[PDB]
Design an enzyme around this catalytic site. Structure first.
Site, PDB file in Angstrom:
ATOM      1  N   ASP A 252      38.119  46.230  41.007  1.00 28.93           N
ATOM      2  CA  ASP A 252      39.233  47.054  41.566  1.00 28.93           C
ATOM      3  C   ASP A 252      39.429  46.546  42.989  1.00 28.93           C
ATOM      4  OD1 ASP A 252      40.696  48.956  42.743  1.00 28.93           O
ATOM      5  OD2 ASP A 252      39.582  50.744  41.990  1.00 28.93           O
TER       6      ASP A 252
ATOM      7  N   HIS B 288      41.078  48.711  38.727  1.00 27.89           N
ATOM      8  CA  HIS B 288      41.572  50.127  38.920  1.00 27.89           C
ATOM      9  C   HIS B 288      42.237  50.682  37.610  1.00 27.89           C
ATOM     10  CE1 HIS B 288      42.575  53.116  41.988  1.00 27.89           C
ATOM     11  NE2 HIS B 288      43.738  53.311  41.386  1.00 27.89           N
TER      12      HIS B 288
END
Length: 233
Positions: free
Chosen positions: A171, A202
């Protein structure tokens, strides 16, 4: 989408709606879900559904109601993503923590409530889950890929109830130095748990995200359900 007629009042008087899922069997612990940046939309409906199927009641408050009530954006539409970013940039985080406190208080006393309340948040809501855990408002808190947690590490000592965080190792809201800070800072308080999912970025638990990773979403989700299960009493 929100449930018609539901209204919750925050400490400063502002009122807002919520999407509510009563439980299959009552009384049941109630989970307040802290939205992403897209408002109370299809992914929140799906999260309410998921939790109700696991035996919880769920309340997802309209945290964007201070700016634009009933906002529910499609993350697949470019124009609505731009709108989600604009709302996120203007979002008052302290007022959002205040609105979640009010939704948690509401969650404690509905007819289907057993009195225990958990909170699960995603992205913007994962960062709010940490701030709520530092305040102590819920029995257990869970945050999926909260952004900016490395800037809130001075609050680690204030967490006094369990809180679980699922973070993607790919992420890029959390680059390596930020990961290390969070890992070391959360590591000092055993009430905090953080897991890193190396092959996930993410939004990896939203099935409709290009970043969806089924193995990680599944491992994260089961850890979340095992973590919330003691609230079932």
């Amino acid at each position: 989408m929100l449930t018609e007629g539901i209204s919750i009042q925050s400490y400063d008087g502002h009122t807002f709606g919520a999407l509510v899922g009563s439980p299959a069997k009552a009384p049941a612990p109630v989970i307040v879900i802290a939205q992403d940046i897209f408002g109370v939309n299809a992914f929140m409906r799906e999260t309410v559904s998921w939790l109700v199927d696991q035996g919880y009641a769920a309340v997802c408050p309209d945290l964007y109601a201070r700016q634009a009530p009933g906002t529910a954006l499609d993350p697949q539409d470019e124009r609505q993503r731009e709108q989600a970013y604009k709302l996120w940039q203007a979002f008052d985080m302290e007022a959002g923590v205040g609105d979640l406190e009010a939704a948690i208080h509401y969650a404690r006393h509905q007819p289907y409530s057993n009195g225990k309340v958990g909170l699960v948040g995603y992205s913007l809501g994962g960062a709010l889950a940490f701030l709520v855990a530092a305040k102590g408002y819920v029995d257990r808190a869970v945050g999926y890929y909260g952004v900016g947690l490395e800037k809130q590490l001075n609050k680690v000592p204030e967490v006094k109830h369990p809180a679980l965080f699922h973070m993607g190792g790919q992420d890029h809201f959390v680059p390596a130095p930020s990961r290390q800070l969070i890992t070391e800072g959360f590591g000092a308080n055993p009430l905090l748990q953080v897991h890193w999912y190396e092959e996930a970025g993410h939004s990896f638990a939203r099935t409709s995200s290009s970043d969806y990773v089924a193995s990680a979403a599944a491992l994260a989700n089961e850890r979340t359900l095992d973590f919330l299960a003691p609230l079932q009493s």
